[PDB]
Amino acid sequence: MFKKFDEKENVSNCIQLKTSVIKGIKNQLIEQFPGIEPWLNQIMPKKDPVKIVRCHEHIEILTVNGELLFFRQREGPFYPTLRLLHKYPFILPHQQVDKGAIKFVLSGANIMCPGLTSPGAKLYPAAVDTIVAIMAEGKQHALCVGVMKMSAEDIEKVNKGIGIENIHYLNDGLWHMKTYK
Amino acid sequence: ADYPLRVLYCGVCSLPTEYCEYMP
Ligand SMILES: [Zn+2]
């Protein structure tokens, strides 16, 4: 979603949200990510203004104190940024690709089922459309936010095709935008 | 039991230092 993204050519503007809208977005974050609820006072303090950075193709980025927390496109689901996920890795269920696939997902490629079924990888049960944190064999931190395009049982069985859609990866255009300011 | 984690990001490639390997 951010492979050729950058502030100049993609960010139209940045609106500050009213209290009515913030409570609604928090509620949607709760519904999507149940375990985030006890941490929201910490991620989005009462005291701090909440902004949406509006981007081309109806991408919105939620920011607090200039830190990028979540993003969505249209009124689709929210996805954590990788920076937020690194601070709170438990927000998302995990899938672990084999180390050979690291180079390809860091260049923006979608995850193919052999990256998840080969030795060194770890595939965990997941329904299609689940937002997952992509971990890497031998690596402590997540490198990609993905969406299951086949269920994890299908990925084991079909074993060919896109298993996981690459949505956001380390040093993509979103990653490079460290803060909004 | 205490969060947020503070992950060290490399000062040149901006990645976690375990991913430096992948950035020239
Ligand atoms: Zn580095």
Author numbering:
A (entry chain A): 1 to 181
B (entry chain B): 25 to 48
Q: Paper's wording?
A:
In some cases, when there is a short upstream open reading frame (uORF) that precedes the main ORF, ribosomes can translate the uORF, terminate translation, and then undergo a poorly understood process called “translation reinitiation” whereby they resume scanning for another AUG initiation codon and then translate the main ORF. We previously showed that two noncanonical initiation factors, density-regulated reinitiation and release factor (DENR) and multiple copies in T-cell lymphoma-1 (MCTS1), are involved in this process. The structure of MCTS1 contains a pseudouridine synthase and archaeosine transglycosylase (PUA) domain fold typically present in proteins that bind RNA. DENR contains an SUI1 domain, similar to eukaryotic initiation factor 1 (eIF1).
Instead, we assembled and crystallized the minimal complex consisting of full-length wild-type (WT) MCTS1 and residues 24–51 of DENR and determined its crystal structure to 2.14-Å resolution. Although we initially determined the structure by molecular replacement, strong positive density near MCTS1-His58 and the three Cys residues of DENR suggested the presence of a metal ion, most likely zinc. We therefore collected a dataset at the Zn-edge and could determine the structure de novo by means of Zn–single-wavelength anomalous dispersion (SAD). The overall structure of MCTS1 is essentially the same as the previously reported crystallization variant MCTS1x, as indicated by the low root-mean-square deviation (RMSD) of 0.71 Å for 181 residues. The DENR N-terminus (residues 25 to 33) is largely extended, lacking secondary structure, while the C-terminal part contains a partial zinc finger (residues 34 to 44) and a short α-helix (residues 44 to 46), which, according to secondary structure prediction, would extend to residue 60. The N-terminus of DENR (residues 25–33) is unfolded and crawls along the N-terminal domain of unknown function 1947 of MCTS1. The majority of residues involved in DENR binding are conserved—in particular, Leu82, Leu170, and Trp175, which form a hydrophobic surface. An extensive network of hydrogen bonds is formed between DENR-Glu42 and the backbones of MCTS1-Gln140 and His141, between DENR-Tyr43 and MCTS1-Lys139, between DENR-Tyr43 and the carbonyl of MCTS-His141, and between DENR-Tyr46 and MCTS1-Lys139. Our structure now reveals that Cys37 is part of this zinc finger. From our structure of MCTS1–DENR(aa24–51), Phe104 of MCTS1 is predicted to stack against the last base in the acceptor stem of tRNA, thereby “measuring” the length of the tRNA and allowing RNAs that terminate at that position to bind efficiently.
